[PDB]
């Protein structure tokens, strides 16, 4: 399975992430699971033309190309032109439509790829759009109705960066023959990642269900969840963030920070803007804006209540302890 | 005039005072109605 | 007021000198206890009055 991965308005972070990959990790994906990596801007030995033959061989069906990995976003900036991404002597978007056409799979890994992510964020100097998304809404670069040649929308991979196994998993189910096992999302995420939420597995869910807060960082995280005062998304975040830990280790939010949404297609939420890093926007000072996933403000707020009537003694202390 | 009848109470201070504390906990209402709208949305859940 | 709410809570929560322990009823069907309550009433007037002759006996079993 031929594998072209190409970058566009990256920050490579989603190639760095793979490259963290165990079991399989990158190397063991790339030679013992029959994908061959034609290329990849961070890793593919060839440069100059011959770089650009095997690129024109992929985008003229010259050779086949199975998975089309595009990370970062498509960049159309200036005027459409998309010369704010030159790549191998064309905009780097002409490239994403030859090789998305060409390709029996398009995954774009990473926000920037899959919903414009970070580049996409007003004022959008670089013209940033996802492949088949701009942030929430469908249609990116490759429009809605864009399928490969397997039938397939573009595999949104999303995160920043995604985490590798998001990416290393749906390889291994192609390259082992249970790509019929792969489902996606109304996001074209993979559901076997996506179902969950960042908060599933998170080690703060029971101070969440206590609606105990973690009321600031370093030492002040060693209890209670970040939702209430540094904005976490978990509860509105799909991820398995906390299923499959990051680096094989821990994650944002175990860590204590707050989960930013990053698998969602607004990320940065709210732009970033004024007020919203870090902090949990409130209405009155004490109903947070946004209530987890599913969840009306009333029945939210009901329960907080009762959880905050019911919280025991441990949901108020340190539990993270040295 | 009707409609100008109110615009006089507009500019009536008392009036103005309360008018001014409703846009100020504008936000409470707000997510108080869009609290009741999704508890309606869920309703059959 | 929440933490008001669990300081009040928190005070009921201690409570002492009540004992509920397996409580459990059945078969005063079987009980003729329409019957019972009958032959009670006919025996009512009858014990209240005789009260002190059986204090009489039961004083005589208290040695
Ligand atoms: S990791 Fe980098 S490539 Fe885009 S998805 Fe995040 S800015
Ligand atoms: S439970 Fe965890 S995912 Fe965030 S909302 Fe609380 S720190
Ligand atoms: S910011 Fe992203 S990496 Fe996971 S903890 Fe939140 S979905």
């Known amino acids: ?322 | 005039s009707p409609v100008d009848g109110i615009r006089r109470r507009l500019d009536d201070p008392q009036v103005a005072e309360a008018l001014n504390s409703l846009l100020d906990h504008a936000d409470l209402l707000a997510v108080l109605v869009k609290g009741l709208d999704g508890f309606v949305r869920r309703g059959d859940d | 007021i929440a933490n008001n709410l669990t300081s009040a809570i928190g005070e009921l929560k201690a409570l002492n000198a009540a004992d509920t322990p397996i409580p459990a009823l059945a078969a005063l069907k079987d009980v003729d206890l329409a019957g019972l309550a009958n032959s009670l009433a006919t025996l009512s007037g009858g014990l209240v009055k005789a009260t002190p002759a059986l204090n009489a006996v039961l004083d005589s079993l208290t040695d």
């Open chain 1, 1 to 322: 399975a031929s594998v072209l991965w190409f970058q566009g308005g990256a920050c490579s972070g989603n190639t760095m992430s793979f490259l963290n990959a165990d079991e399989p990790n990158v190397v063991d994906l790339i030679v013992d699971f029959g994908l061959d990596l034609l290329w990849h801007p961070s890793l593919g030995l060839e440069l100059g033309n011959n770089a650009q033959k095997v690129f024109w061989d992929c985008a003229k069906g010259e050779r086949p190309l199975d998975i089309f990995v595009f990370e970062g976003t498509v960049i159309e900036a200036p005027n459409g032109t998309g010369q704010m991404d030159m790549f191998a002597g064309r905009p780097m978007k002409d490239w994403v439509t030859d090789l998305a056409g060409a390709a029996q799979i398009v995954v774009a890994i990473g926000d920037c790829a899959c919903f414009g992510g970070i580049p996409a964020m007003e004022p959008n100097p670089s013209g940033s759009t996802g492949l088949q998304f701009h942030k929430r809404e469908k249609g990116g670069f490759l429009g809605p109705d864009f399928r490969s040649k397997m039938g397939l929308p573009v595999i949104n991979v999303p995160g920043c960066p995604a985490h590798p196994d998001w990416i290393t998993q749906i390889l291994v189910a192609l390259a082992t023959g249970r790509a019929g096992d792969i489902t996606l999302d109304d996001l074209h995420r993979p559901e076997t990642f996506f179902k969950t939420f960042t908060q599933t597995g998170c080690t703060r869910v029971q101070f969440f269900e206590y609606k105990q807060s973690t009321l600031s960082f370093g030492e002040g995280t060693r209890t209670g969840c970040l939702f209430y005062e540094f904005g976490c998304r978990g509860p509105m975040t799909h991820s398995p963030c906390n299923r499959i830990l990051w680096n094989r280790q821990s994650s944002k939010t175990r860590a204590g920070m707050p989960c930013l949404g990053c698998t969602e297609p607004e990320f940065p939420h709210f732009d970033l803007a004024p007020g919203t890093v870090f902090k949990t926007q409130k209405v009155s000072g004490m109903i947070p804006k946004e209530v987890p996933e599913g969840t009306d403000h009333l029945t939210y707020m009901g329960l907080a209540a009762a959880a905050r009537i019911a919280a025991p003694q441990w949901s108020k202390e340190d539990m993270f302890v040295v």
